Amino acid sequence: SALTQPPSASGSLGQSVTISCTGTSSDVGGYNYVSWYQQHAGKAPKVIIYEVNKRPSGVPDRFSGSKSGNTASLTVSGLQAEDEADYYCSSYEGSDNFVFGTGTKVTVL
Ligand SMILES: CN(C)c1ccc2nc3ccc(N(C)C)cc3[s+]c2c1
């Protein structure tokens, strides 16, 4: 049980990268409860987004979320070197449970 994400994605500096997160009607599509995490290897994960498109304070305006049907997405716009990292989604899935995505390695061209 794991949400589907592309293994990797790339973009040029200044451009954008979009990470999808696909589940089912009982998780991604059933709730507004998608989170996104950014992790550099061997560093703690950052919370980028919760509840599809809510930013904790401190996350720049260039990070946004969208959802339609059973797919949520994170876009990192205005790409910076700083943004190269693995990105993970998760969703509530009912029954007090969460499910996580497989992660996407983002690189800059
Ligand atoms: C019983 N235990 C400790 C917990 C732990 C975390 C939880 N998180 C949720 C988050 C979202 C939500 N929604 C219905 C969207 C439902 C829940 S229930 C829930 C139960």
Residue numbers in the entry: 2 to 110
What's written in the study?
The crystal structure of Mcg with methylene blue shows binding at the A-site of the VL dimer cavity and coordination by the side chains of residues Y34, Y93, D97 and F99. The crystal belongs to space group P21 with one dimer per asymmetric unit, and the symmetry between the two VL domains of Mcg is broken by the presence of a sulfate ion bound to only one of the VL domains. The sulfate ion binds in the hydrophobic cavity at S36 and may block the secondary methylene blue binding site. Methylene blue binds through positive cooperativity. This result indicates the presence of two binding sites, one strong and one weak, where binding to the second site begins only after the first site is fully occupied. In the structure of Mcg with methylene blue, one ligand is bound to the A-site of the dimer. This differs from equilibrium dialysis results in solution, which indicate at least two methylene blue binding sites. The three experimental findings are: cooperative binding of methylene blue as measured by equilibrium dialysis, binding of the ligand to the A-site in the crystal structure, and the absence of monomeric VL in complex with ligand. Taken together, these observations indicate that the secondary binding site of methylene blue may not be available in the crystalline state, but available in solution. Secondary binding to either the B or C-sites may require conformational changes that are less favorable in crystals or induce the higher-order assembly of complexes larger than dimers. The ligand concentration that effectively inhibited amyloid formation in these assays was 500 μM for methylene blue and 250 μM for sulfasalazine.
